[PDB]
Every structure is written in C-alpha cells, then in structure tokens.
Design a protein around this nucleic acid. Sequence first.
RNA 1: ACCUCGAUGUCGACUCAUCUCAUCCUCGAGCUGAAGCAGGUUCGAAGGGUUCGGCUGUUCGCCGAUUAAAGAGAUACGUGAGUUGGGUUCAAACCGUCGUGAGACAGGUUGGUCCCUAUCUAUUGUGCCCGUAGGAAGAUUGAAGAGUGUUGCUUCUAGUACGAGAGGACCGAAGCGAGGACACCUCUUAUGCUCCAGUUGUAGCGCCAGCUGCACCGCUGGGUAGUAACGUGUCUAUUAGAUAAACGCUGAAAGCAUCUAAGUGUGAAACUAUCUCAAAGAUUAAUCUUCCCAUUUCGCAAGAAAGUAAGAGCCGUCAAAGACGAUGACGUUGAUAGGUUACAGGUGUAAGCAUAGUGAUAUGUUGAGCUGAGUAAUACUAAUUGCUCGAGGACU
RNA 2: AGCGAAAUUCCUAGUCGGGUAAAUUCCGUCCCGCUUGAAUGGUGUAACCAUCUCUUGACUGUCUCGGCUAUAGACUCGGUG
RNA 3: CAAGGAACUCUGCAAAUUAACCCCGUAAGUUAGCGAGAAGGGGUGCUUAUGUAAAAGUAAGCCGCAGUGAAGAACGAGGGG
Lengths: 229, 115, 119, 122, 56
Amino acid sequence: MEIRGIFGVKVGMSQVFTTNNERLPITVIYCEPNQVAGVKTEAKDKYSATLLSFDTVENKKLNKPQQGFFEKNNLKPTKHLQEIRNMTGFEMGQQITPQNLFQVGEYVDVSAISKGRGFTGAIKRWNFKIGPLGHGAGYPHRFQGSVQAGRGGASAQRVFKGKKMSGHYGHEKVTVQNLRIVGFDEANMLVLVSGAIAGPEGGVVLIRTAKKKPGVVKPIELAVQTEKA
Amino acid sequence: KINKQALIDLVEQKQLKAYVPEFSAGDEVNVAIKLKEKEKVRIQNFTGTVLRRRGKGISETFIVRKTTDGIPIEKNFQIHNPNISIELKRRGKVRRAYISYMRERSGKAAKIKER
Amino acid sequence: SYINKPGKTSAWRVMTVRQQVSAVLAYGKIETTLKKAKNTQKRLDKLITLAKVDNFNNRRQVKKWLLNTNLFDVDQLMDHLFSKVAPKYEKTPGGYSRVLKLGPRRGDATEMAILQLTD
Amino acid sequence: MVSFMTRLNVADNTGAKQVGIIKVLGSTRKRYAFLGDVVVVSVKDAIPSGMVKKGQVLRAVIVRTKKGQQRKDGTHLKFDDNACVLIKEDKSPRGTRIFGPVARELRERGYNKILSLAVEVV
Amino acid sequence: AVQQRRSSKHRRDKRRSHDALTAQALSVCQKCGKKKLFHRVCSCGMYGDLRVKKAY
RNA sequence: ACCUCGAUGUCGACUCAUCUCAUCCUCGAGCUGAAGCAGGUUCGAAGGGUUCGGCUGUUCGCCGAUUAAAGAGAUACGUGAGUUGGGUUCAAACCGUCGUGAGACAGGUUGGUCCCUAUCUAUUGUGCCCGUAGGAAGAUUGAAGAGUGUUGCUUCUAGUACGAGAGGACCGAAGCGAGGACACCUCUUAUGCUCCAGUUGUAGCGCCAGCUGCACCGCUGGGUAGUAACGUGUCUAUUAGAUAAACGCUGAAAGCAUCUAAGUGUGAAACUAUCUCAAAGAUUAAUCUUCCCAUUUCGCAAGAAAGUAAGAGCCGUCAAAGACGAUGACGUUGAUAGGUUACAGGUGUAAGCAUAGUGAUAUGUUGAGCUGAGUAAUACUAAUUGCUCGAGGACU
RNA sequence: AGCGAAAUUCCUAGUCGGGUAAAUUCCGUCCCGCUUGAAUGGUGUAACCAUCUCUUGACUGUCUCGGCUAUAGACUCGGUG
RNA sequence: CAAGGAACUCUGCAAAUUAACCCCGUAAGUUAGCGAGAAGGGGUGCUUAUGUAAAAGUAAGCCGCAGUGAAGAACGAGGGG
C-alpha cells in the first residue's frame, strides 16, 4: 500500500458552482512542491517511508549544523521536515508535483493541526447541557456536572484516570477524510479542495491518500455559463 | 515569497459573469431562473425589489422579495450562479444600502423611481 | 459581587488618550506606562497624518479629539501645530514618534515609557 | 424553527383556522422540523362548516416556513409565516384547493397530488 | 478548606522551591556611566547614544 | 443492632454518568403442530443505543403521540464541601377526629432561613530541574496504550420463491436518511463597547451652521474580522485472523453409526487487527542523521593554559499561540509589531457651495465622505553598537 | 334546616358530565356524612387581596439551545498581607 | 440575540410583554357607590399658516424605516375557595 502525500498551507476559503447543479464551498490550500530528503526501505530500516522537506528558507538561517546536513546532500534550504509512511517509489532529491499524485475527483485525507483554543471549559469542550435557570439559577450553572459516585469505602473511593474535564482542546493534527479535490493551479502550485480544513490561516496541512479507500476518481466537473446582452 | 491573497481572487477568475450589470438597493428587477428538469426546461420570471447587496467578490449576494397570492417570499441570489439571468426593470432611491422595514411592510409602501 | 468601581471603559480610554495627545502636542514629551504609550501613539500618528493637510473640514475632524490644556488651548494649539510642527513631519511616511522604555515605576514597578517626537 | 405545540394556519379546504404540532414523524429525538417533513397535528380552531372537528389529531406536512431553509441551488427562499397542509393517510391530501404558492423541494420526493392543486411551485 | 493536619516544614520547602526567583538583565551604558538594565534609559537620562533628558 | 448516635444532609428532579448481564432492538444460530408473512422456544453475543408529552411532591401507575427498540438490576433506591428545597415533621395558621385538659394524629391543608477561599490523594491541561553515559539540532519506530466504529426509510432485485385466495420473501444492490462526533466560517444566521447612518434633549465650543460629553454602546438599523450554529462538509465504512453460539468432512474407541478423540475446517453488531490520537520519565530510558569541539597533557578526562565556536538563556517586538509558564516568528544584516501607501470590505451621496421654496426640504457637487480588528509594498517609528552558561567522547 | 368527596371522605386517584388530543389536581353533580354540622355558627353574598389555585390571549434566553460582547473578579508583576 | 411559545417546571418562581398625554369606547355583577385607566381601539416628529391671553387645537406641506425617537412610565381576561 503506497500513499502519496504533499504539504501545504490553508490560504483562503471560497465557493463554486459545479455540475449536478449544486454550489459547493472550496478550501484554498497552497501546496508547495517538495524535495525528497530521503527514503527508508522496508529491508534495512525495518519499515518503508519517505522523508520530505518543505517550507523553504534562506541561507543565513537554518543553523550551520542543519545547513551542513543539507549541503552534504545538496538539499534545498527548508524550515520543516516530515516523513510519509509506506512510500519508497522515488529517488533522492526528486521534485514532486501533486498533479501526478492527486486528481480532479479522488478523495483524500488531510492531517492538520486545529485552531488553538487554550483553556476551554468542559461544556465548551464536551458539549453538554447548561444547568437550568428557572426557579433559581443557582450560584453555579455552567460547570462540569458531577462525578460523585463513591460513598463508603467500597464504591469508588477516588476518581478514575482520563475523566472528562476542562482543559486544552484543539490545536492537534486532526485527520479529515473523504475530501474531494476540486482543482489544481499548476502555475501557482495550489489546490482547491471540497469540505473544510482545520487550523488558522496558513496552517500546516499534510494531504495524503484517504485511508477509507485506495483512491478512485469521480467525474467532478466544474460548471460555468456565460450570459451576454 | 509572499502570499497577497490576490491568488484567492485569481483562482476564481474563471467564474466571473460576462456582463455583470450594475445596480443597487431599492431597484425593481425581474430575474430569470432556468428550471432544468431533464425532461423539460422551464424559465421562471421572479420580480421584486433589492433588499441588500453584499460584496466579497465571487460571493455577491442580494435578496429579492415578491408578494404572490398575499404570500411574501424573499430569495437570495448571486450573479455568479450559472443558469441565472439578471434583467433590470427600474431603479429607485434609498438612504441606505440595507432595508428591514420593507422586509416587514405591506402594499402601497413601495419606493417610487427617480429619473 | 455588586456595586464597586465601574472599571476601565472604552469611553474612559478614548478620553484619556485624547487628553494625553493634547498634552504631548502642547509639550512634546510624555512619560507614562508603556501600555498607554503604545496604543496612544497609533491615534497620535493618525491625527498627525490628518493634520498634514490644512483644511477646515480636517480641522473640524481633529476638533473631535482636542481638549483644553493649561500650556495650550485648542485654538492656540492648532495654530502652533500647523505653524511649526506639521511642516517638519510632512517629508516622512509615518513613524512620527519615539517610545523609549523607562525603568520600573517607584509606585508599582511597571516598566514606564516616554513618548517624544520632533527629531 | 417550527417545533411541537406550534399552532400555524392551514392552506387547503378543511374549515380549520389554526393547528399545532404534537410530534414529528420519523426517528426519535429529531426535535428539528424542516421543509416537507410529515408531522402529527391537532387542530386548534375549526368551524363546523368545513370538514374537520376540534380536538382531532391527524397528519400534515409543512410547506411554507417562517424560518426558511437553504436549497441545494444556493438560493434561499423564505416566508414571513408558517403554512401546513393536511394529508389523508397517504400521499393524497385531504384538501382540493390550495391557497398560496408552494416549493419544488418535495417534487423529487413525490407529492404530485399537492402540486396538481397548487398554482405556483418554486 | 482546612488541612487534615499542619503542613510539614519540608513540604513548605517543596512549596517554595519552585517559587525561587532569578536575576534580571544588565547592560553597560554605551554613552553614560555606570551599569543599567537592558533596553532602558540610563541615569544620565538617555537611551544608548540618544541624549533625551537631563540626568537629574 | 457489631463501626456512627463527641456526625452519613436526607427523597424526588436537573447536569454528569458508570458497572454487570438473568439480553430490549440492531447481529447470528438451533428447533418448532413455523407453506411464505406474521410467529414462538432456547442459546451465543454487553459493541452501540434505547423518547417526548398530560395527571402527580411522588417512583410506580393511567392515557396519547410515538419511536427499529422504550431491557433488568447496582454504583448509600449514584450524583448538596455540583444545583433547587419542590414533601414532610423547627416554630406559625386551619379543617375532621381523639382526650375534660394543656395537646396529638400511626391525617390532611396554607405560607414556610441550604455554610465552607482545597492540604494531600485522584483527574485534567500545564510547566521547571535532571537523567538516559561528551553536547546540540532533528527525524523516527513503537512494549503497553487511549477514541469510536449506532440504526431507520425508499427503490430495484421481485410479486420472482411461496400459498390458491388474501397476502407476501431469504440474500444482494443503490439512494435518502436519524442520533452522536470531527472541522470550518464561502454562503446564511447571532453578536459585533475606538465602523457607519439616522435621531431626541441637555451643557458647552464668544453666536448660526457644524462638532464633542452626558443620557445603558443614549436610542434605533445595519455592518470588517472575530467567535458559535440554526449553516455547510465529512465520519458510522471496508477487509483479515482467531473464534462464541452454531454448522461440517474423515474417522475410531464401541467392526455400526459418529462435527471429536487426532487432523481438517465454516462461522457473530463479541475479541484482535484496519482507521484516529499520544508517545522511549518504555529508568527495560530504543533506533537513525547531521553538526560543535576533541589547541601532547598533570587530577577518578583537560582550570598547570585557550574554557564552543553548536546551541541554549536573560530583554524587546510579538500571535496562528497563550490563565501565567510555555509553543512559534523576528531583533537593524530586520517585514516582528505599529505608522505611511494602496487594496478588500462596510456605512451609503461627508463637510461645504449654488439653485427653487415662506422653510422644513429636494436637486447637482456626490458613489462623495469616512471606515477598531482584514490584505500586501514599505525601515518611517519601536526590536542597543547588550550580556550569562555552555567544548575536549566519559570507563571497560 | 342547610351544605357536602368541601382546608372536613380512610376506603377514593370514589361516579358521571365539561375543558383538557392526552388532566389523581380544575369545574358542575351524586349524597351510606367511619367522624358534616348550626353561633369554637350554617348557606349564598358586593368592593379588596405583596392569600392560594385552574385555564386562556400577548410576551419571551424557563425551556430544544446555546452563542456574542464590557467590566469587576480569577491569573500575572509590585506593596501589604 | 433567529424561531416555537410554558412544552421546562410542584406550579408562567422569575424574567419578559403593556405603559406618559389627550381623542373614541368600555362588558357582566351589583349592596348603585363601584366595577374601570375596565377591556379594546386613534394618534403625539418637524415647518408654515390659522388658532385664544397662552396652550389644546385645525388646515397645508416635509422627512425618517421607525417621531412621551433617551431617560419616569399599570400585562389582561375568565373560574373556584
């Protein structure tokens, strides 16, 4: 099972009218073509994968150890470096175009770090009912509920690990699946995709083949008409 | 290396309408809508005045209200939507770019047109 | 719980920054807390750029932010500015003030800042 | 959104004036009405000169909505009030003359009998 | 809420262990005399190489 | 009545649930006096979920709409140092009764005071120090793990099989779905306290006009980003192993028969996988890449000298982040923030002038005018010509 | 005499009818009233109710279903403590 | 603050809705006084003119989407004890 991937950033949100006569919203993701930093075959490294570099930078940054590492392999000076599992069918330092990997109808998946929300209450995080406000709203009415289930030295006597509670929510690389690719901009090296993409503007996203299916293209056609008078 | 977000406007340039007629709120218009049913093609004329006109480039939306059989109906429309034809009938005047009273008023309260 | 200090309000903030910009336009240098200095400097630059054009409607607009000081009055201060201060900054695209960190205040140990202008 | 115990007017030959929702037909805890959803209703006001009696619970479908829902076209039609039409035990509606226009969001779902008695369909 | 029993002195040391303070920045005045703090105006009333105020 | 009567605040309800299986449905199987459809019995199976209303302090109970289905118990008939005090039985008032009587009901009725700033443990995020065998910058696998994988309708298959008639399949395919969850703000909603328009009065700007403060943001209507959905899009799936119930082959003991004894299998919403997430504090401290120094060398490895140069840290600008710490970027060589410039977008014809009118007003100027957060070119201003720790591959 | 499932009825959530889609509480009515009861009064009774209850019209953030904004808090730095 | 309006709930506890002025009109009951601001409807801006001593007013014209434009403004009805 080979999975082809690419790295990009969410640069905008848009919409379009397509065939079947229905309007669809489109995420705009600038997908930077990448350079093969290395490969790990499943004969010596114990598993198959391909490490890529992206987010290119200048030559005065990228501290001298990593600069010398890049120069040793004649690697493009980049800020970010990530690997994609189960892909070895390429050579060292190859430029990859998403067009050769993704099509106009294939469903894909995106791992993207969500928008950071910092400290969020349990209700804002677990989406439970707010306490009643009639006949006395009570001093607290927006809180966790209750975990009181232990009475006597034999029922609970303590709280269980991993109990739902307020805290840090989001800002994690969530995987969204079955995103129908809408279009490609070869000149500007960008992609337009259906659905929604987590994270803030310019958030780092990794687009790979969906794990719900091996990847089958569908007749996605964009609809345009021209009235004139 | 820079992201101007003009690329957002660039990717959707293939979708712009040809004539893009100009108008504003308080204008009576009869929009033509293509009802394609795969067994017969029906064209419906929906008349009424403009309620608002939002921008945002490709997403210019505008609400048009009709009163048929004593039933008021308001429909939001976008020029960029294919199979939709926009025809201007008359243009009036309004001291705003948004209305709420007309969204809850009745007959004999429409706006007169100015030459 | 209940009735107490009304707290800091946007109206109080705008009145305070108006007073501070009037004072600095009267004097030239203002030593305060850095938090007020940084956000005051933005409106100060906006008003200076507005005053770069000597027109009666612009005078009307800037009167919405001017107040009365002991050193200068609104009528006195407008003429003073348009006479000497406005022509000098007319050759520079923005950045008409300098905010420099002062030491911690003797009363609250907050890192004060001094805002100045005119080279 | 329209919900249970929401009295709205009727739009056909019944003789009733107002009628309220009691429960939306279908899976439990849906609790959210939409266009074309079949519901159980109880008449609120009715004259004997019609063909309905007070206190009887029957089945109806909402056709016009004050809330408004957005259609797949992307053009969102709304109404300033809520309208419901009673249906007799199946796709066939009790009434013969419909008052006011209707929408096409239920044409693909059948209900050709209702549109055969409607003047305009959106 | 009251404790079950009074806190131990070593527990107090644990409480104040992470409460330990650090030092702060220092900088020699590039134009004025004795040392001052970083990104500050010197006792001579100036930013580095920027006479703006009287010393006293 | 054996801890407790020198302390367990207790019932129902809301939020929050959890555990088990004597299993409600969804799943499957065996059998049936089960033609099919509608059934019944028993078993495996706890993966998931299993309503809203009327009466009532009430569980229960009754009715209605139902829903694929409205399971059975327990966690002190869970849940007050989370909430209300809704029933009693503090006291007060009243009805009937009991007693001669104060009073009482093993009756009811009326209104009838809910304290705690968390020390540890447990939890959630969050960090500092140090360790992993010189140090730093990175990429990683993953031993054990955590999430959830629910289900209905319609159409075709097909009125085929079946029965005769009524009626009406097994299996399979497609679409529509419901509950819950994930993400976003292109649309649409909701706001939008340094956006705008109008509008009233007041007090002012020497007066008019025009402005500011006040009157909840003074009020009303919109509106940039922002945030959430009532909005969109997706998820529920697919597959495999071992299997439960159950179905078998060969085949004996027991020349027969025989799914069992050996061998062989088939076989479930159950288990493990597949998918999502985290990670070597995984001290059992794992793997790999690069770089720094290793300028004989006294001492248990460099202070008898150079004490990193790699980096990290203090400080500033900060925001994709953020309670604070931290995470991430930039510090004159810089676009890090703000300003300028212009753009997007919003309000929607500024002020002022001229014309007609007795004047409010209307007309041209005028799509003018301005616009907190968005967008990019821009060193114009603020990020100092600033400082601290930090090298010798330890030993075999 | 009068009244009566009433601030009095355990049986009883008594019977019937009305509203209530669906009501043990609501209303009218039935009086075997364990133990109603005539000045610890009995039956109707106007104005009044910070008395109680039932139903209805508008109103809705009580509720499906929560979301948004500003302060005072919380937290961070100082002083005191 | 979008919708539904009591469904939540012991029960519309609350909250919310109405409201100041004058112009019409105002039910049953009845002890004739009350009910009653019953209920429910019309409007209040500006300019000019007419208005009487002043207003209230009347006529004409004009604007805003809304004019006791902000602040002080009774929710109501029916039934029972």
